[PDB]
Amino acid sequence: TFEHLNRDTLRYINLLKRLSVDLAKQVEVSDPSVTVYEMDKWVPSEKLQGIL
Amino acid sequence: KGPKELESINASMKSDIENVRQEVSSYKEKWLRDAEIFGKITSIFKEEL
């Protein structure tokens, strides 16, 4: 039983970061004073975050 | 496109209609403002014309 619980907590670790399918980003802006955009702080919509 | 961009495109056109309609009738008034004072000698000059 411990030899099964140890193997299923390594594939849980190997599923949160390593293979980890994510979203494809569309950039929306509203203020006209930004002019630079780094693609790290793109967060999804408020209605999609509540569903996910 | 994206709906948050199309909301900013469609609302920008609606404000532009509120700008061009207002600024046309500013020229429609001043061309009639020129018309009421042009006929002080020209209509009499039309009788000379």
mmCIF file of N, CA and C in Angstrom:
data_model
loop_
_atom_site.group_PDB
_atom_site.id
_atom_site.type_symbol
_atom_site.label_atom_id
_atom_site.label_comp_id
_atom_site.label_asym_id
_atom_site.label_seq_id
_atom_site.Cartn_x
_atom_site.Cartn_y
_atom_site.Cartn_z
ATOM 1 N N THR A 1 0.822 -1.205 0.000
ATOM 2 C CA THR A 1 0.000 0.000 0.000
ATOM 3 C C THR A 1 0.859 1.260 0.000
ATOM 4 N N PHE A 2 1.925 1.293 0.812
ATOM 5 C CA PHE A 2 2.867 2.411 0.766
ATOM 6 C C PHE A 2 3.625 2.484 -0.549
ATOM 7 N N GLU A 3 3.836 1.360 -1.214
ATOM 8 C CA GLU A 3 4.491 1.364 -2.512
ATOM 9 C C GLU A 3 3.564 1.838 -3.627
ATOM 10 N N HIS A 4 2.276 2.013 -3.343
ATOM 11 C CA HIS A 4 1.319 2.584 -4.277
ATOM 12 C C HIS A 4 1.031 4.041 -3.972
ATOM 13 N N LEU A 5 1.038 4.427 -2.701
ATOM 14 C CA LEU A 5 0.843 5.808 -2.290
ATOM 15 C C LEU A 5 2.050 6.676 -2.603
ATOM 16 N N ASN A 6 3.247 6.094 -2.618
ATOM 17 C CA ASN A 6 4.453 6.830 -2.974
ATOM 18 C C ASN A 6 4.562 7.085 -4.467
ATOM 19 N N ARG A 7 4.010 6.205 -5.295
ATOM 20 C CA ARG A 7 4.110 6.379 -6.736
ATOM 21 C C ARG A 7 3.043 7.329 -7.259
ATOM 22 N N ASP A 8 1.908 7.411 -6.575
ATOM 23 C CA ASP A 8 0.834 8.298 -6.983
ATOM 24 C C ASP A 8 0.970 9.698 -6.414
ATOM 25 N N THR A 9 1.964 9.946 -5.566
ATOM 26 C CA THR A 9 2.239 11.319 -5.173
ATOM 27 C C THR A 9 3.455 11.872 -5.894
ATOM 28 N N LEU A 10 4.112 11.056 -6.715
ATOM 29 C CA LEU A 10 5.112 11.577 -7.636
ATOM 30 C C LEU A 10 4.504 11.932 -8.981
ATOM 31 N N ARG A 11 3.397 11.295 -9.370
ATOM 32 C CA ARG A 11 2.759 11.715 -10.612
ATOM 33 C C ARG A 11 1.786 12.855 -10.364
ATOM 34 N N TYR A 12 1.484 13.149 -9.103
ATOM 35 C CA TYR A 12 0.756 14.371 -8.793
ATOM 36 C C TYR A 12 1.672 15.586 -8.811
ATOM 37 N N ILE A 13 2.913 15.434 -8.343
ATOM 38 C CA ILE A 13 3.926 16.481 -8.451
ATOM 39 C C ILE A 13 4.319 16.729 -9.898
ATOM 40 N N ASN A 14 4.355 15.685 -10.717
ATOM 41 C CA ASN A 14 4.790 15.747 -12.102
ATOM 42 C C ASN A 14 3.658 16.148 -13.040
ATOM 43 N N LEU A 15 2.603 16.769 -12.516
ATOM 44 C CA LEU A 15 1.407 17.085 -13.282
ATOM 45 C C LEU A 15 0.963 18.511 -13.018
ATOM 46 N N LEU A 16 1.496 19.126 -11.968
ATOM 47 C CA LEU A 16 1.196 20.505 -11.632
ATOM 48 C C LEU A 16 2.105 21.507 -12.313
ATOM 49 N N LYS A 17 3.314 21.122 -12.675
ATOM 50 C CA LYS A 17 4.258 22.047 -13.286
ATOM 51 C C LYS A 17 4.848 21.553 -14.595
ATOM 52 N N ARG A 18 5.121 20.261 -14.741
ATOM 53 C CA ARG A 18 5.983 19.815 -15.825
ATOM 54 C C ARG A 18 5.234 19.692 -17.140
ATOM 55 N N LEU A 19 4.027 19.134 -17.129
ATOM 56 C CA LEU A 19 3.392 18.908 -18.422
ATOM 57 C C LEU A 19 2.159 19.783 -18.653
ATOM 58 N N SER A 20 1.320 19.967 -17.628
ATOM 59 C CA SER A 20 0.690 21.245 -17.249
ATOM 60 C C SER A 20 0.155 22.081 -18.419
ATOM 61 N N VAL A 21 -0.918 21.592 -19.050
ATOM 62 C CA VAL A 21 -1.536 22.292 -20.178
ATOM 63 C C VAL A 21 -2.110 23.625 -19.723
ATOM 64 N N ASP A 22 -1.854 24.684 -20.497
ATOM 65 C CA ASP A 22 -2.317 26.021 -20.153
ATOM 66 C C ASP A 22 -3.024 26.704 -21.323
ATOM 67 N N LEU A 23 -3.495 27.927 -21.082
ATOM 68 C CA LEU A 23 -4.342 28.685 -21.987
ATOM 69 C C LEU A 23 -3.498 29.441 -23.005
ATOM 70 N N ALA A 24 -4.128 29.847 -24.102
ATOM 71 C CA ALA A 24 -3.487 30.655 -25.130
ATOM 72 C C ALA A 24 -4.009 32.079 -25.008
ATOM 73 N N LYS A 25 -3.099 33.045 -24.988
ATOM 74 C CA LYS A 25 -3.455 34.370 -24.512
ATOM 75 C C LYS A 25 -3.763 35.331 -25.651
ATOM 76 N N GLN A 26 -4.897 36.013 -25.523
ATOM 77 C CA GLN A 26 -5.285 37.140 -26.363
ATOM 78 C C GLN A 26 -5.066 38.393 -25.531
ATOM 79 N N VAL A 27 -4.368 39.380 -26.086
ATOM 80 C CA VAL A 27 -4.064 40.566 -25.299
ATOM 81 C C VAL A 27 -5.146 41.611 -25.510
ATOM 82 N N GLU A 28 -5.762 42.041 -24.409
ATOM 83 C CA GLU A 28 -6.743 43.119 -24.406
ATOM 84 C C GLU A 28 -6.187 44.230 -23.529
ATOM 85 N N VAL A 29 -6.284 45.473 -23.993
ATOM 86 C CA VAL A 29 -5.905 46.644 -23.210
ATOM 87 C C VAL A 29 -7.013 47.678 -23.320
ATOM 88 N N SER A 30 -7.098 48.556 -22.322
ATOM 89 C CA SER A 30 -8.150 49.564 -22.301
ATOM 90 C C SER A 30 -7.574 50.963 -22.130
ATOM 91 N N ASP A 31 -6.512 51.097 -21.312
ATOM 92 C CA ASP A 31 -5.934 52.422 -21.164
ATOM 93 C C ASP A 31 -4.938 52.702 -22.283
ATOM 94 N N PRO A 32 -4.910 53.932 -22.805
ATOM 95 C CA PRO A 32 -4.005 54.242 -23.917
ATOM 96 C C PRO A 32 -2.635 54.731 -23.487
ATOM 97 N N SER A 33 -2.285 54.612 -22.211
ATOM 98 C CA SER A 33 -1.004 55.098 -21.727
ATOM 99 C C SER A 33 -0.068 53.982 -21.287
ATOM 100 N N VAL A 34 -0.149 52.796 -21.893
ATOM 101 C CA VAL A 34 0.656 51.675 -21.414
ATOM 102 C C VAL A 34 1.902 51.477 -22.287
ATOM 103 N N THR A 35 1.729 51.278 -23.602
ATOM 104 C CA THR A 35 2.713 51.245 -24.697
ATOM 105 C C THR A 35 3.760 50.133 -24.615
ATOM 106 N N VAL A 36 3.892 49.473 -23.464
ATOM 107 C CA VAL A 36 4.797 48.343 -23.260
ATOM 108 C C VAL A 36 3.960 47.244 -22.622
ATOM 109 N N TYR A 37 4.151 45.999 -23.024
ATOM 110 C CA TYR A 37 3.391 44.923 -22.416
ATOM 111 C C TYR A 37 4.261 43.686 -22.302
ATOM 112 N N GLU A 38 4.591 43.316 -21.070
ATOM 113 C CA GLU A 38 5.255 42.058 -20.776
ATOM 114 C C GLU A 38 4.214 40.958 -20.627
ATOM 115 N N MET A 39 4.482 39.816 -21.247
ATOM 116 C CA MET A 39 3.512 38.721 -21.288
ATOM 117 C C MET A 39 3.727 37.744 -20.131
ATOM 118 N N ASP A 40 3.816 38.296 -18.927
ATOM 119 C CA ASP A 40 3.891 37.495 -17.717
ATOM 120 C C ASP A 40 2.664 37.772 -16.869
ATOM 121 N N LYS A 41 2.215 39.024 -16.871
ATOM 122 C CA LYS A 41 1.100 39.417 -16.026
ATOM 123 C C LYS A 41 -0.213 39.419 -16.792
ATOM 124 N N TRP A 42 -0.347 38.537 -17.773
ATOM 125 C CA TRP A 42 -1.633 38.337 -18.427
ATOM 126 C C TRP A 42 -2.419 37.335 -17.600
ATOM 127 N N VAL A 43 -3.546 37.777 -17.058
ATOM 128 C CA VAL A 43 -4.419 36.918 -16.269
ATOM 129 C C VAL A 43 -5.707 36.728 -17.060
ATOM 130 N N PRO A 44 -6.429 35.620 -16.892
ATOM 131 C CA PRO A 44 -7.669 35.444 -17.657
ATOM 132 C C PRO A 44 -8.811 36.313 -17.157
ATOM 133 N N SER A 45 -9.983 36.146 -17.763
ATOM 134 C CA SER A 45 -11.141 36.967 -17.439
ATOM 135 C C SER A 45 -11.665 36.660 -16.043
ATOM 136 N N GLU A 46 -12.522 37.542 -15.534
ATOM 137 C CA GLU A 46 -13.086 37.337 -14.207
ATOM 138 C C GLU A 46 -14.151 36.252 -14.232
ATOM 139 N N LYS A 47 -14.792 36.065 -15.387
ATOM 140 C CA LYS A 47 -15.839 35.058 -15.497
ATOM 141 C C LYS A 47 -15.246 33.680 -15.757
ATOM 142 N N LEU A 48 -14.043 33.631 -16.331
ATOM 143 C CA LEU A 48 -13.402 32.343 -16.573
ATOM 144 C C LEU A 48 -12.645 31.865 -15.344
ATOM 145 N N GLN A 49 -12.140 32.796 -14.535
ATOM 146 C CA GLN A 49 -11.422 32.417 -13.324
ATOM 147 C C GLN A 49 -12.368 31.813 -12.295
ATOM 148 N N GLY A 50 -13.618 32.276 -12.273
ATOM 149 C CA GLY A 50 -14.582 31.716 -11.342
ATOM 150 C C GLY A 50 -15.071 30.342 -11.759
ATOM 151 N N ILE A 51 -14.967 30.026 -13.049
ATOM 152 C CA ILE A 51 -15.412 28.722 -13.537
ATOM 153 C C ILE A 51 -14.308 27.689 -13.350
ATOM 154 N N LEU A 52 -13.061 28.092 -13.601
ATOM 155 C CA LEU A 52 -11.945 27.153 -13.535
ATOM 156 C C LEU A 52 -11.591 26.797 -12.096
ATOM 157 N N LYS B 1 -11.764 39.221 -33.572
ATOM 158 C CA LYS B 1 -11.186 40.120 -32.586
ATOM 159 C C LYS B 1 -11.606 39.686 -31.188
ATOM 160 N N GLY B 2 -11.321 40.541 -30.217
ATOM 161 C CA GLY B 2 -11.727 40.303 -28.855
ATOM 162 C C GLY B 2 -12.848 41.234 -28.457
ATOM 163 N N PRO B 3 -13.762 40.752 -27.610
ATOM 164 C CA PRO B 3 -14.927 41.571 -27.240
ATOM 165 C C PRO B 3 -14.599 42.780 -26.386
ATOM 166 N N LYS B 4 -13.503 42.765 -25.628
ATOM 167 C CA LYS B 4 -13.118 43.961 -24.888
ATOM 168 C C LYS B 4 -12.435 44.985 -25.781
ATOM 169 N N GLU B 5 -11.950 44.565 -26.950
ATOM 170 C CA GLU B 5 -11.450 45.519 -27.933
ATOM 171 C C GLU B 5 -12.590 46.069 -28.774
ATOM 172 N N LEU B 6 -13.510 45.192 -29.184
ATOM 173 C CA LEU B 6 -14.653 45.597 -29.998
ATOM 174 C C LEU B 6 -15.594 46.511 -29.223
ATOM 175 N N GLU B 7 -15.644 46.353 -27.898
ATOM 176 C CA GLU B 7 -16.372 47.304 -27.065
ATOM 177 C C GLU B 7 -15.705 48.674 -27.086
ATOM 178 N N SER B 8 -14.379 48.703 -27.248
ATOM 179 C CA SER B 8 -13.670 49.977 -27.265
ATOM 180 C C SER B 8 -13.594 50.549 -28.676
ATOM 181 N N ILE B 9 -13.810 49.713 -29.691
ATOM 182 C CA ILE B 9 -13.905 50.222 -31.056
ATOM 183 C C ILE B 9 -15.295 50.793 -31.309
ATOM 184 N N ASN B 10 -16.333 50.067 -30.889
ATOM 185 C CA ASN B 10 -17.702 50.472 -31.196
ATOM 186 C C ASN B 10 -18.123 51.697 -30.393
ATOM 187 N N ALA B 11 -17.595 51.844 -29.177
ATOM 188 C CA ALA B 11 -17.939 53.010 -28.369
ATOM 189 C C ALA B 11 -17.154 54.238 -28.812
ATOM 190 N N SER B 12 -16.008 54.024 -29.463
ATOM 191 C CA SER B 12 -15.226 55.149 -29.965
ATOM 192 C C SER B 12 -15.882 55.757 -31.195
ATOM 193 N N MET B 13 -16.578 54.933 -31.979
ATOM 194 C CA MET B 13 -17.308 55.443 -33.134
ATOM 195 C C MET B 13 -18.545 56.214 -32.694
ATOM 196 N N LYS B 14 -19.187 55.759 -31.613
ATOM 197 C CA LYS B 14 -20.386 56.425 -31.112
ATOM 198 C C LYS B 14 -20.062 57.805 -30.553
ATOM 199 N N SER B 15 -18.872 57.962 -29.972
ATOM 200 C CA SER B 15 -18.452 59.277 -29.500
ATOM 201 C C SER B 15 -18.065 60.173 -30.667
ATOM 202 N N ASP B 16 -17.606 59.568 -31.764
ATOM 203 C CA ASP B 16 -17.172 60.348 -32.916
ATOM 204 C C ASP B 16 -18.376 60.876 -33.688
ATOM 205 N N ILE B 17 -19.491 60.142 -33.651
ATOM 206 C CA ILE B 17 -20.738 60.639 -34.231
ATOM 207 C C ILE B 17 -21.270 61.806 -33.403
ATOM 208 N N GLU B 18 -21.029 61.772 -32.091
ATOM 209 C CA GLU B 18 -21.427 62.885 -31.233
ATOM 210 C C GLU B 18 -20.484 64.077 -31.380
ATOM 211 N N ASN B 19 -19.368 63.892 -32.088
ATOM 212 C CA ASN B 19 -18.434 64.994 -32.291
ATOM 213 C C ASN B 19 -18.638 65.649 -33.653
ATOM 214 N N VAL B 20 -18.936 64.848 -34.678
ATOM 215 C CA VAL B 20 -19.002 65.380 -36.038
ATOM 216 C C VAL B 20 -20.370 66.005 -36.301
ATOM 217 N N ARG B 21 -21.423 65.437 -35.700
ATOM 218 C CA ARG B 21 -22.757 66.035 -35.784
ATOM 219 C C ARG B 21 -22.793 67.408 -35.127
ATOM 220 N N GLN B 22 -22.085 67.557 -34.006
ATOM 221 C CA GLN B 22 -22.044 68.836 -33.307
ATOM 222 C C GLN B 22 -21.232 69.865 -34.082
ATOM 223 N N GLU B 23 -20.175 69.422 -34.764
ATOM 224 C CA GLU B 23 -19.242 70.369 -35.365
ATOM 225 C C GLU B 23 -19.662 70.732 -36.787
ATOM 226 N N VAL B 24 -20.516 69.912 -37.408
ATOM 227 C CA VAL B 24 -21.111 70.296 -38.688
ATOM 228 C C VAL B 24 -22.074 71.461 -38.492
ATOM 229 N N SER B 25 -22.935 71.372 -37.474
ATOM 230 C CA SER B 25 -23.957 72.399 -37.282
ATOM 231 C C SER B 25 -23.367 73.682 -36.708
ATOM 232 N N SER B 26 -22.107 73.642 -36.271
ATOM 233 C CA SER B 26 -21.388 74.879 -35.988
ATOM 234 C C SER B 26 -21.042 75.610 -37.280
ATOM 235 N N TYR B 27 -20.757 74.858 -38.347
ATOM 236 C CA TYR B 27 -20.494 75.488 -39.638
ATOM 237 C C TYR B 27 -21.791 75.814 -40.365
ATOM 238 N N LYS B 28 -22.859 75.073 -40.070
ATOM 239 C CA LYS B 28 -24.156 75.370 -40.667
ATOM 240 C C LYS B 28 -24.747 76.652 -40.093
ATOM 241 N N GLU B 29 -24.320 77.028 -38.886
ATOM 242 C CA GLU B 29 -24.812 78.260 -38.283
ATOM 243 C C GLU B 29 -24.011 79.457 -38.784
ATOM 244 N N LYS B 30 -22.691 79.297 -38.902
ATOM 245 C CA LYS B 30 -21.831 80.425 -39.249
ATOM 246 C C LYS B 30 -21.946 80.780 -40.725
ATOM 247 N N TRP B 31 -22.422 79.839 -41.541
ATOM 248 C CA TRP B 31 -22.643 80.121 -42.955
ATOM 249 C C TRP B 31 -23.983 80.813 -43.160
ATOM 250 N N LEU B 32 -24.893 80.657 -42.197
ATOM 251 C CA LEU B 32 -26.108 81.462 -42.189
ATOM 252 C C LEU B 32 -25.866 82.776 -41.451
ATOM 253 N N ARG B 33 -24.894 82.791 -40.530
ATOM 254 C CA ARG B 33 -24.486 84.038 -39.886
ATOM 255 C C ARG B 33 -23.801 84.969 -40.881
ATOM 256 N N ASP B 34 -23.065 84.400 -41.836
ATOM 257 C CA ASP B 34 -22.518 85.191 -42.931
ATOM 258 C C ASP B 34 -23.599 85.594 -43.927
ATOM 259 N N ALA B 35 -24.729 84.885 -43.940
ATOM 260 C CA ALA B 35 -25.752 85.140 -44.950
ATOM 261 C C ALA B 35 -26.650 86.311 -44.568
ATOM 262 N N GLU B 36 -26.856 86.543 -43.268
ATOM 263 C CA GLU B 36 -27.766 87.609 -42.865
ATOM 264 C C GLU B 36 -27.103 88.978 -42.942
ATOM 265 N N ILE B 37 -25.771 89.021 -42.998
ATOM 266 C CA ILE B 37 -25.079 90.303 -43.032
ATOM 267 C C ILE B 37 -24.524 90.578 -44.430
ATOM 268 N N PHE B 38 -24.497 89.566 -45.301
ATOM 269 C CA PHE B 38 -24.045 89.787 -46.670
ATOM 270 C C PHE B 38 -25.092 90.520 -47.491
ATOM 271 N N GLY B 39 -26.365 90.387 -47.127
ATOM 272 C CA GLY B 39 -27.426 91.060 -47.849
ATOM 273 C C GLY B 39 -27.744 92.440 -47.316
ATOM 274 N N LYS B 40 -26.709 93.239 -47.047
ATOM 275 C CA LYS B 40 -26.878 94.620 -46.617
ATOM 276 C C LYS B 40 -26.556 95.599 -47.739
ATOM 277 N N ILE B 41 -25.697 95.212 -48.682
ATOM 278 C CA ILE B 41 -25.460 95.969 -49.902
ATOM 279 C C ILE B 41 -25.563 95.092 -51.145
ATOM 280 N N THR B 42 -25.339 93.779 -51.005
ATOM 281 C CA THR B 42 -25.238 92.889 -52.160
ATOM 282 C C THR B 42 -26.600 92.670 -52.811
ATOM 283 N N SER B 43 -27.660 92.591 -52.000
ATOM 284 C CA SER B 43 -29.018 92.517 -52.533
ATOM 285 C C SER B 43 -29.397 93.811 -53.246
ATOM 286 N N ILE B 44 -28.880 94.940 -52.761
ATOM 287 C CA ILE B 44 -29.029 96.201 -53.483
ATOM 288 C C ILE B 44 -28.077 96.227 -54.675
ATOM 289 N N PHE B 45 -26.885 95.643 -54.506
ATOM 290 C CA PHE B 45 -25.970 95.469 -55.632
ATOM 291 C C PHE B 45 -26.527 94.477 -56.646
ATOM 292 N N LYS B 46 -27.386 93.553 -56.194
ATOM 293 C CA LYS B 46 -28.084 92.658 -57.114
ATOM 294 C C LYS B 46 -29.032 93.435 -58.018
ATOM 295 N N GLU B 47 -29.648 94.495 -57.486
ATOM 296 C CA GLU B 47 -30.450 95.384 -58.320
ATOM 297 C C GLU B 47 -29.564 96.171 -59.273
ATOM 298 N N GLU B 48 -28.328 96.447 -58.860
ATOM 299 C CA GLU B 48 -27.365 97.031 -59.784
ATOM 300 C C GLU B 48 -26.761 95.967 -60.694
ATOM 301 N N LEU B 49 -26.922 94.688 -60.338
ATOM 302 C CA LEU B 49 -26.281 93.625 -61.105
ATOM 303 C C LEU B 49 -27.089 93.269 -62.348
#
